[PDB]
From Swiss-Prot:
This is Peptidoglycan-recognition protein LF. Belongs to the N-acetylmuramoyl-L-alanine amidase 2 family. Peptidoglycan-recognition protein probably involved in innate immunity by binding to peptidoglycans (PGN) of bacteria and activating the immune response. The gene is PGRP-LF. The chain crosses the membrane at residues 87-107. Residues 23-149 form the N-acetylmuramoyl-L-alanine amidase domain. It is found in: Membrane. It comes from Drosophila melanogaster (Fruit fly). Disulfide bonds join C37-C43.
Length: 165
């Protein structure tokens, strides 16, 4: 279940932003450092609120992430596959971001949230958005941040395609 901008009731982007050359080789895992969401209506509310924060507080053209996944086990489309993402605690790696909605410092995401990210990535490969040999990194490997949270970072150690280096 993938909710696009029309389904999470988002605003259109306020301007253009550099395109991503596809397929991309890297996925970067974030957390949103907000409350999590375990049912669609709450996830949609969170998405709207995060988009507003990014657009109004930071002045960005759109919610910063390419994709987000909710504790409801659903995928939320942010900027999508074709547009470069933007992130607090920035980095320049050519990649697509997936933000786990929530804060995973001392709690883990439910299985269904992790499974949503996995499903998103396999679809990326099928539709030629992600290279077949793509690698997965944590935001904190690339920038001085806690993101995606200690507990989620621990879980990632055993993920297929997770790259320590
Ligand atoms: Cu949909």
């Amino acid at each position: 279940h993938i909710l696009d901008r029309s389904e999470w009731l988002g605003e259109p982007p306020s301007g253009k932003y550099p395109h991503l050359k596809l397929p991309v080789s890297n996925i970067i895992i974030h957390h949103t450092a907000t409350e999590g969401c375990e049912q669609e209506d709450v996830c949609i509310y969170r998405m709207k609120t995060i988009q507003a924060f990014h657009m109004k507080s930071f002045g960005w053209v759109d919610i910063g992430y390419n994709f987000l996944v909710g504790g409801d086990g659903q995928i939320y489309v942010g900027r999508g596959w074709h547009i470069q993402g933007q992130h607090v605690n920035g980095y320049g790696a050519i990649s697509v971001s997936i933000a786990f909605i929530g804060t995973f410092v001392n709690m883990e995401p439910p299985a269904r949230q992790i499974e949503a990210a996995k499903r998103l990535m396999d679809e990326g490969v099928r539709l030629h958005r992600l290279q077949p040999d793509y690698h997965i990194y944590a935001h904190r490997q690339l920038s001085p941040t806690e993101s995606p949270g200690q507990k989620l970072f621990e879980l990632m150690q055993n993920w297929p395609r997770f790259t320590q280096d």
